[PDB]
Swiss-Prot record, chain A:
It comes from Thermus thermophilus (strain ATCC 27634 / DSM 579 / HB8). This is Small ribosomal subunit protein uS11. The keyword rRNA processing does not apply. GO terms for cellular component: ribonucleoprotein complex; ribosome. Part of the 30S ribosomal subunit. Interacts with proteins S7 and S18. Binds to the C-terminus of IF-3; however exactly how IF-3 interacts with the 30S subunit is unclear. May contact the C-terminus of Era. One of its GO terms (molecular function) is structural constituent of ribosome. Disulfide bonds: none annotated.
Swiss-Prot record, chain B:
It comes from Thermus thermophilus (strain ATCC 27634 / DSM 579 / HB8). Part of the 30S ribosomal subunit. Contacts proteins S9 and S11. Binds to the C-terminus of IF3 and to the C-terminus of Era. PROSITE patterns: RIBOSOMAL_S7. Keywords: Ribonucleoprotein, Ribosomal protein, RNA-binding, rRNA-binding, tRNA-binding. SUPFAM superfamilies: Ribosomal protein S7. This is Small ribosomal subunit protein uS7.
Swiss-Prot record, chain C:
The keyword Glycoprotein does not apply. The chain holds residues 16 to 88 of 88 of the full protein. One of its GO terms (cellular component) is ribosome. This is Small ribosomal subunit protein bS18. GO terms for molecular function: small ribosomal subunit rRNA binding; structural constituent of ribosome. The keyword S-adenosyl-L-methionine does not apply.
Amino acid sequence: KRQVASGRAYIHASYNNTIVTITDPDGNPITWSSGGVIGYKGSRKGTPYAAQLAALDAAKKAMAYGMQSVDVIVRGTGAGREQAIRALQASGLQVKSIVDDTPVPHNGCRPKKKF
Amino acid sequence: ARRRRAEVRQLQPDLVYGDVLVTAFINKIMRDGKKNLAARIFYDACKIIQEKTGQEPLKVFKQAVENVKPRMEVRSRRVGGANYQVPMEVSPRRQQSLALRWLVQAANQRPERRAAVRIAHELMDAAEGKGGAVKKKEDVERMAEANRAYAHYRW
Amino acid sequence: PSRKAKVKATLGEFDLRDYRNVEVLKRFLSETGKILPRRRTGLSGKEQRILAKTIKRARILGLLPFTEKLVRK
RNA sequence: GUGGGAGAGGGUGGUGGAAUUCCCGGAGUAGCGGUGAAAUGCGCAGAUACCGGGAGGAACGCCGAUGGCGAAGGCAGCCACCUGGUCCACCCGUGACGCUGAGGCGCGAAAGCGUGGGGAGCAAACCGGAUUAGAUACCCGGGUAGUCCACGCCCUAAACGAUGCGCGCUAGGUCUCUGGGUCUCCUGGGGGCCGAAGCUAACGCGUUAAGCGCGCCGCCUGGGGAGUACGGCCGCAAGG
């Protein structure tokens, strides 16, 4: 118990694994859940189900801190970005607003072989 | 089937009860087209239900079927050079088909000697939610949401 | 379709070179901080070419953004 | 000559924000990352995801086009300075002063060479991981030269429109950048597509000619052997 109502929920999606981190209003993470932490270990994490789980068990750990309100922040394009959000929208948390602030360079580091 | 959906064969109701669901069931018992025998099996198998159960076998039959129709199944699919099991919602046609077929495939596995009996008993333990006709049901669905990790393809 | 309403049609006489007029420019930026394409601005080959340079200026004087975040998704 | 215009044309100095890596702090756990799968690797000296702070190099989203500029190679964040080309209008001034152009001189992508600086990302070679009958590969994780900067050299190329420069002449339609006009239309320069006559082995070309013609340079003359051999010239070398 630490009683921290209303916080932020960063959702970091990939083409290899989706994760979630729940931070406090200030920006400090309270509890974070990935995909490889649930049980799955490889090709499995990219799945929308993998993300679903990752999202849900990540809220269950927040309800423990009395988390009620949350602003959702999505990072990137993964496989099941959606399902992660739709997850929190049913986990029992009040969803303020969904934010998309995926990091696009304005042409900087020369990307590697696979663009 | 390549050009059309192919019309489904309409059957003749039963001479006794009159439910076509009956006709379907027997057909499934019938081997080597001995439909005169297959009929007796069902009948005497109903008589066993009256003597051992205080209910009308017609209704009993139905509740049994009703209870085995699995509502979820798997369908193999080569997605990216691999066998991914893809759960999917089952149609009314297939349900009916699967039920009867399992009611009989399980039935004949019973440790009982007489065939009319073996069927009679499967129709009872069925309704009560047990036996093996219903086990081959829960075993299927136990694969449905088992790999519901993959429900994101076709349909 | 993109046949919503161009920003030139719903606007008045305004100087393309006054890079300080934020109240207007903002009309030329997307829901993000990006520069609207000609299909959306309603402008011409020459106009857009200028409006381009002008925004990159007001950006510099911390007036107009370089990129926003999104409200839905 | 005078008055307009457009442009990623070049040079120098400067400066803006995104992202990346690294460093520090905060908070926080058990994984992260990567693949068709996987492993190599990174994490309890606490990684990942998240916030804040700092350093540094590279590059410059959107606008951006089937667009513009340039002799070509090639050129795009913003600003200022220095500078080349060019187009239009007026028809003012010179009075044929013009075209071409062996050798020459200059420019010349990428890689590569010297000395010095710099090094974030990427990445020959090289080190491991997996794949396979095998893999000195295609895939994954690292990684040195190099790639960025200066001065100097190298000078090649599918350096391509694979189409030398310059002038005149020969239906149009349409889209587009740009200038003048009496501007629902005329008129100049440029970029595209379709297409008359004509040409073409055909494909195609077609007022951006591969058409009808004149000038001048360059080059070809069976394939392989060879862009080799010899010789000379060049270069630090690689080589040309």
